[PDB]
Structure formats: C-alpha cells, structure tokens
Design an enzyme around this catalytic site. Structure first.
Site, mmCIF file in Angstrom:
data_model
loop_
_atom_site.group_PDB
_atom_site.id
_atom_site.type_symbol
_atom_site.label_atom_id
_atom_site.label_comp_id
_atom_site.label_asym_id
_atom_site.label_seq_id
_atom_site.Cartn_x
_atom_site.Cartn_y
_atom_site.Cartn_z
ATOM 1 N N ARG B 223 0.866 -1.177 0.000
ATOM 2 C CA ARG B 223 0.000 0.000 0.000
ATOM 3 C C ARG B 223 0.905 1.230 0.000
ATOM 4 O O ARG B 223 1.826 1.329 0.818
ATOM 5 C CB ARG B 223 -0.926 0.034 1.234
ATOM 6 C CG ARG B 223 -1.997 -1.062 1.307
ATOM 7 C CD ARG B 223 -3.285 -0.715 0.541
ATOM 8 N NE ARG B 223 -4.372 -1.651 0.850
ATOM 9 C CZ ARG B 223 -5.560 -1.290 1.337
ATOM 10 N NH1 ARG B 223 -5.828 -0.010 1.543
ATOM 11 N NH2 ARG B 223 -6.493 -2.202 1.600
ATOM 12 N N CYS B 270 -9.486 -7.134 -2.196
ATOM 13 C CA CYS B 270 -10.913 -6.826 -2.128
ATOM 14 C C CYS B 270 -11.394 -6.121 -3.390
ATOM 15 O O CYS B 270 -10.755 -5.177 -3.861
ATOM 16 C CB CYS B 270 -11.158 -5.923 -0.919
ATOM 17 S SG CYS B 270 -12.883 -5.493 -0.592
HETATM 18 N N1 LIG Z 1 -7.621 11.899 5.201
HETATM 19 C C1 LIG Z 1 -6.942 11.330 6.219
HETATM 20 N N2 LIG Z 1 -6.165 12.076 7.037
HETATM 21 C C2 LIG Z 1 -5.482 11.521 8.065
HETATM 22 N N3 LIG Z 1 -5.514 10.207 8.361
HETATM 23 C C3 LIG Z 1 -6.258 9.352 7.612
HETATM 24 C C4 LIG Z 1 -7.030 9.877 6.474
HETATM 25 N N4 LIG Z 1 -7.674 8.831 5.929
HETATM 26 C C5 LIG Z 1 -7.338 7.724 6.643
HETATM 27 N N5 LIG Z 1 -6.504 8.040 7.652
HETATM 28 C C6 LIG Z 1 -5.907 7.095 8.630
HETATM 29 O O1 LIG Z 1 -5.205 6.088 7.891
HETATM 30 C C7 LIG Z 1 -5.411 4.791 8.451
HETATM 31 C C8 LIG Z 1 -5.957 3.869 7.367
HETATM 32 O O2 LIG Z 1 -6.881 2.948 7.909
HETATM 33 P P1 LIG Z 1 -8.116 2.391 7.040
HETATM 34 O O3 LIG Z 1 -8.978 3.534 6.568
HETATM 35 O O4 LIG Z 1 -8.774 1.290 7.837
HETATM 36 O O5 LIG Z 1 -7.417 1.651 5.783
HETATM 37 P P2 LIG Z 1 -7.120 2.285 4.330
HETATM 38 O O6 LIG Z 1 -5.868 3.120 4.471
HETATM 39 O O7 LIG Z 1 -6.955 1.058 3.488
HETATM 40 O O8 LIG Z 1 -8.365 3.078 4.017
HETATM 41 C C9 LIG Z 1 -6.338 4.991 9.641
HETATM 42 O O9 LIG Z 1 -5.547 4.988 10.832
HETATM 43 C C10 LIG Z 1 -6.924 6.379 9.494
HETATM 44 O O10 LIG Z 1 -7.026 7.002 10.776
HETATM 45 N N1 LIG Z 2 -11.128 -3.834 1.653
HETATM 46 C C1 LIG Z 2 -11.563 -3.272 2.778
HETATM 47 N N2 LIG Z 2 -10.743 -3.186 3.821
HETATM 48 N N3 LIG Z 2 -12.807 -2.799 2.873
HETATM 49 C C2 LIG Z 2 -13.851 -2.812 1.851
HETATM 50 C C3 LIG Z 2 -14.955 -3.777 2.223
HETATM 51 O O1 LIG Z 2 -14.718 -4.643 3.099
HETATM 52 O O2 LIG Z 2 -16.057 -3.669 1.638
HETATM 53 MG MG LIG Z 3 -7.490 -0.827 5.933
#
Ligand SMILES: Nc1ncnc2c1ncn2[C@@H]1O[C@H](COP(=O)(O)OP(=O)(O)O)[C@@H](O)[C@H]1O
Ligand SMILES: N=C(N)NCC(=O)O
Ligand SMILES: [Mg+2]
Ligand SMILES: Nc1ncnc2c1ncn2[C@@H]1O[C@H](COP(=O)(O)OP(=O)(O)O)[C@@H](O)[C@H]1O
Ligand SMILES: N=C(N)NCC(=O)O
Ligand SMILES: [Mg+2]
Lengths: 387, 366
Positions: B223, B270
């Site tokens: 990622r 996903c």
């Molecule tokens: N716009 C943003 N600004 C700051 N932190 C963010 C933002 N978007 C997501 N995060 C943080 O990045 C991390 C990503 O977690 P998550 O949303 O579960 O997975 P993904 O990065 O795949 O969306 C979380 O800890 C969240 O608090």
């Molecule tokens: N891939 C994820 N972490 N979330 C999307 C979902 O579960 O629909």
């Molecule tokens: Mg995630």
C-alpha cells in the site's frame, strides 16, 4: 476425479510444497515468543516430515497448528494447546507430533492405551461439599460424529447434517430427560445473553481458539442448545465440538450431577447408535475431538470454588499443578475469577476412567478447601502441599 | 453432498456477495479450484461470516485469493464490481492520470479539513494474496519489496521497520498517529485469513518526515501512502504521484510484476480496490450538516464513502469524518480526486448554509 481435487484443496490455500521453489524450512513457523503445547513439541524436523502430507479430507498440517501460531500468549489462566485435529485422520497422519502433545497434556505415553469406561457414580467417595465453599457443580464431556470432519474444517453441509442427526436423536429421550432444541439462528440477543450469563450457553464466537481454528465459520448456521425443563441436563450443538453433553446444578452435590450425567450420557450414546450414526472413536485414545485436551473420556468436571484465603497464598498454583487440576474463571476459560471464586476441574482426560477423574476432582477439592480452612485460622499448610 | 447442501444461509446478511450470489452461480463455481488451489468457498467466506457492520458502509463480503480468482468466478465477480464502481463487463479502465496540475481546487480551509491522505494498494504477481498465501510466500514478498524500496532517493527514501522487531509501544504510537495500520482485529482482516502467523512478514516503510509510507503484508501486499496535516490535497497528490511512479519502476526493475489486467487495472485482495485502487481522503469537520436528515443521502449521490476518525473500523468522533472517493475502477486518479474535491466543496458550503441558519435543499444533488 474433479471432486478429488476439490476435496484435497478443502483449505483453499496455496500449498508451498508442491511447485518446488520452497523448502519446508522456508515455511517453518516462527515460534520464538510462543507459549503453547504445539510450540513446545514442534521441531523443524517434524515439520519437514509433515508439511507436504494431506489427509483424505484435504486437511493439511498447517491447518492443524494454525491456532498455536496465531496465539503465542493468554490473557487468562493456563497454557493453551496451540493445535487442533481437523478430522478423524489428523492424529494418524501426524502421529509423531500429536503423540508428544498428548504426553505433555495427559501424561499418557506413546506406549500407553486408554482404559475401559467406568461411569458408576456409586463407587465415588465424597463429592458432597459444603455449599459455603462450593457454589455449583458441573460435569461435561464431548463427542464427535463418525465420518464427519470436525468443526475446524467441516463444511456447511456436514454441519447441517450434524445438527439434524443430533437434534433428532435428542428427541428420543424421555422422563426428566425429555426436552427441546433451541437453534441459535432464531434466538434473539437478550435470551442468548441471559443463558450465557446463567452458565447454560456457550459464549459469543469471540474466543481465540474458536475463531483462529475456524469453528466460527458461518455462525450461527448449525449452532444450537438442547436442554430439559429443569435445565440440569443440556447438550450443545456445533460450537467447539459437534456435541457437548452437560450435567449441572447449583450447590455442591457433585455426586448427584454425576449420577445424572451417567444416566443421560448412556441414553444419548445409545440413541445416536439407535439412529445409525456412530461416534468418532480410536482404540488407543478412546474418543476424539477438535482439541487434544478433549480425548479419552473427554470428561471435564469442575466446581465453582470460592477460595478467599488460599488464592492469596504463594503456592496455590503449584498445588493445582501437582493436584493435576485446571483453573478457569467464574464465567469460563476466557474469564477471570470473581468474588475470589475459581472454576476448578480435572485437567487430564486420557489415561483414566470417568469415575477415576471425578474422584481426582473430589480428592483435590477437599485438600483445596481444607487449606483455605487452615489459612483462616492463622496456620500453615506447607506440609499439606504435595511434594 | 451437492452444491445446494452447502449454499450459505444469507437470510440476515447485508452486503454485496449476499446481494449478488445466486444459487445458480454457487452450483457452478463451488467445485472450481483456481490454479493455486484457491476455492469459491474460500473467496466468499468473509461475507458469510459478516452479515452486518457495526460501523459505516455496506461491506463487500468477498475477496480474491490469488491472481486467478477474478477470472475463475467472473460471472459472480462482475456483478459485485458493477454494484460498487458502477462498472460494466463491457467497460474498460482508462489510462492512468497522475498529473496533479490539472486538478481544480484541492486546497481546502484549515477550519474544515484537518488533514488529507492519498493511498493505493499493489499486488506482487507470482504469489498468492494475503488471504491464501503461505508464510513462505509472505516472507518472499517482504524481502522483494523492502529491497526495491532501498532504491528510493531524495526526500522520499526512508527505512523499513519490520513489525516482528517493533515494540508494542512504538507500534501503538504509530497507529494513534494514523501512520501505521491497526492491530489485527478487523472483521474483514481476520475472517478473510489476512492475519495468520501475525506479524510474520509484516512491516511499514516510511521516510523521515513521515509523509510518504508503505504497508507491507496487511490486507494487500503493498500500500502506497501520502498524507499530511492541513487541507492541501493538491500537494499530497503531487507527492503521492512521484513516489508511486518511483515505486512501480523499482519493482519493475527488480523483475517483479504487479498483478494487472488490461481491462480492470491493478488488482488486490478486495473488489473495492481495483483499477487505480486509489483512496483519497480528507478529515472533515461537519458540526451542522451531520445532523441533517438528508446527509448520508448526499454522500451516496456524490459517490463519497464515509468513515470514522480512526478509519473503517471506527465511528466519527468530534463531528469529524473520514470522507473519501467511493469508486476506484472506471476513472483515472485525477478524476477521482476531482470527485472527492468537488464533493468536499459542496459539503462545506452546505455546512455554512445550515450554520447561517439557512436551508440546503437546492444544494442536495438531484
Ligand atoms: N484523510 C486522512 N487524514 C489523516 N488520516 C487518515 C485519512 N484517511 C485515513 N486516515 C488514517 O489512515 C489509516 C488507514 O486505515 P483504514 O482507513 O482502515 O485503511 P485504508 O488506508 O486502506 O483506508 C487509519 O488509521 C486512518 O485514521
Ligand atoms: N477492503 C476493505 N478493507 N474494505 C472494503 C470492504 O470490506 O467492503
Ligand atoms: Mg485498511
Ligand atoms: N462448576 C460449574 N458450575 C457452573 N457453571 C460452570 C462450572 N464450570 C463451568 N461452568 C460454565 O460453563 C461455561 C463453559 O465454560 P468453558 O470453560 O468454555 O467450559 P467447557 O470446557 O465445558 O467448554 C462457562 O460459562 C462456565 O461459567
Ligand atoms: N480447547 C480449549 N477450549 N481449551 C484448551 C486449550 O485452549 O488448549
Ligand atoms: Mg469451551
């Protein structure tokens, strides 16, 4: 032939042995910080010898040890087993690894062999404890259905087979044993919760072993509880194990809890027979289940035992170890004591009889209670601790 | 046992797989193993296990085990894709657009947006994805990815901090600072197999400033993350684009291919993360709109995904929301950040109206 492939890929994971860019050594689990029975007995050698071998049902070795990899520690009481059997074939396919576990747990050697059944509750000395100390009594054992995969790997269809089969024969019981099945799928939350709080129902599928081994797949399809009007004879269906048959009541009259368990177990084992379905049984180790702690008699008999002084003693846990007794919490394995009260039960299941194991609980219970008494009286128990 | 004896009981469920899985499509795929041994039951398990969601969003409920999964069960996976990215079996995914200069706006008001973030996942070809891969493969992916990452020069270079050798207190701090991924308790993560042997082969790479980062072996192999405080999306996009370019090149250089399909762009665990596999998010402060009866309805229309302050598996705290672009497949990168920005623009205005004791019906998309 296509079904053969499907069946042997039951896991749906990549098999690192087959295409050849990896050695077993290249997959060898990291158990550096691990404290379970699998990480105690697993040797790089054993892995090299066992990783590429798959049971008729598609079970792999890693399928087996995955819960011990995924679970180095424990926030509660005891050292876990860190491995499950997936089918009736897993012990035989990996005998040299599982024999070692069985030894640590049960003290039951590769050369050893399980003794005849003894369910005569009348041969039992003691068992009736003062209710001051003993808050309630419970005896349970587990059984698997023959020719079916165990919970960790059993598919949807096999689980729906089990529920039908078992919830069928359970309706053959009569008298103070007659009763009714209550499938979890239609059970609303408050009822479910009140049955768990009350000690008659298995927890929400949040347990470590439950989730990491794969007994919580598809929840709650196939999961249900059967009990009598009195709710002192209950059967669980499709949680950790296809079947757990459970005798219990409040107080300290163990002997009566055993007299009923013995009465209900024989019926259930007979009715299952009476419907054409046998129960997974091995000649050497008796009865087989998901966990290698649950073998032989598969019996675990416990008390809720309040120990307000002895618990504070330095050598309490040692005494338990020597007295060969588990120590769990008020609400169970994944819980801590409350009001200074411990679920206390026989630890070994393979290599003694039902009565012999229940006598152990009884005999050790007396010592545990007798020491709480000595302590209260500003006295010493240094000599009443086994050597 | 037929296929029909094992068809999931989805009476309660609410998600895509439950929504797109027919008895007909189960009978056909249930006994179909991919080249790498991944099964159809393997693929959909996470959704059977998960009928509901404690937090925001209707969940996906299915995943690819490997690089061959999409192809094997395509008649079912094409229906999930169409619900999500509004993408048809006939459609195609555009050529990448990483030019942040064509971006309009993308610099919101410090009052309203506390920070911005742009990320996408990448998948190393030749080995299974987190849901089905062995320890052998995961150790393999980790070595190959952390090598290539040494290649970074300039302000982008950083260090690789393996998770097995990181202590719980550093780990807790990185997560609370939004940099690192959360402990392995997510329903998707655990029930889809992505937390086996945890943390073996897990880690995070990040530059000094901690504005450019990489996740290794959580849900997806790789990622790529750009983020910073404030409300300068246009900058984070600027940085994001540079580094992702460098990253793909280095990986291309080490003779390592990412899982890509000429139609569907880049492919990950996903079905939500396909195409550009891009999620551009802002942390939005919405004290007035959030109480509005048509709020969620606006996001839906705007194609905005809603999340909490702590990520997916959290609710909003402090009238602050994690707002982002919903789709990833079917639109370039530039286009989705424009959809994010345009929506976030609207949301802010609406908030201002409600705050001025004013109404916003004409503001709600038709
Ligand atoms: N716009 C943003 N600004 C700051 N932190 C963010 C933002 N978007 C997501 N995060 C943080 O990045 C991390 C990503 O977690 P998550 O949303 O579960 O997975 P993904 O990065 O795949 O969306 C979380 O800890 C969240 O608090
Ligand atoms: N891939 C994820 N972490 N979330 C999307 C979902 O579960 O629909
Ligand atoms: Mg995630
Ligand atoms: N002696 C006892 N009296 C009453 N309830 C008990 C006793 N021992 C265990 N239980 C209850 O049985 C439930 C099952 O706990 P667990 O340790 O998972 O048992 P098992 O080994 O039979 O699965 C728990 O809620 C626990 O409170
Ligand atoms: N199977 C159990 N519930 N307990 C024994 C263990 O965890 O090793
Ligand atoms: Mg239990």
């Amino acid at each position: 032939a296509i079904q053969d492939y499907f069946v042997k890929n039951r896991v749906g994971h990549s098999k690192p042995w087959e295409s050849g860019k990896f050695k077993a050594a290249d997959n060898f689990p990291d158990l550096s910080k691990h404290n379970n029975v699998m990480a105690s007995q697993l040797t790089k050698e054993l892995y090299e010898k066992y990783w590429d071998k798959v049971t008729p049902n598609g079970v792999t070795f890693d399928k087996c040890i995955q819960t011990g990899v995924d679970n180095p520690g424990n926030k509660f009481y005891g050292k876990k087993t860190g491995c499950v059997f997936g089918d009736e074939y897993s012990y035989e396919c990996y005998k040299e690894f599982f024999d070692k576990c069985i030894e640590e747990i049960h003290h039951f050697k590769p050369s050893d062999k399980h003794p005849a059944p003894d369910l005569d509750h009348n041969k039992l000395v003691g068992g009736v404890f003062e209710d001051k100390y003993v808050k309630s009594c419970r005896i349970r054992c587990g059984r698997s259905v023959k020719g079916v995969c165990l919970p960790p790997a059993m598919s949807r269809a096999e689980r729906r087979l089990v529920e039908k089969v078992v919830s069928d024969a359970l309706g053959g019981l009569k008298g103070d044993l007659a009763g009714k099945y209550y499938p979890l799928t239609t059970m609303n939350e408050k009822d479910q919760e009140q049955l768990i709080e009350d000690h008659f129902l298995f927890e929400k599928p949040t347990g470590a072993l439950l989730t990491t081994s794969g007994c919580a797949r598809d929840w709650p399809d196939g999961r249900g509880i059967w009990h009598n009007n009195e709710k002192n004879f209950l059967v669980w269906i499709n949680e950790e194990d296809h079947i757990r048959v459970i005798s219990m009541q409040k107080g300290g009259d163990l002997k009566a809890v055993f007299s009923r368990f013995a009465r209900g177990l024989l019926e259930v084992e007979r009715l299952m027979k009476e419907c054409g379905h046998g129960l997974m049984h091995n000649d050497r180790l008796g009865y087989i289940c998901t966990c290698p702690t649950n073998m032989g008699t598969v019996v675990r008999a416990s008390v809720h035992l309040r120990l307000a002084f002895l618990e504070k003693h330095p050598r309490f846990d040692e005494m338990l170890g020597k007295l060969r007794l588990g120590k769990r919490g008020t609400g169970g394995e994944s819980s801590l004591a409350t009001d200074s009260t411990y679920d206390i039960s026989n630890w070994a299941r393979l290599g003694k009889s039902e009565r012999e194991l229940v006598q152990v609980l009884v005999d050790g219970v007396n010592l545990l209670i007798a020491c709480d008494k000595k302590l209260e009286a500003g006295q010493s128990i240094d000599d009443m601790i086994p050597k």
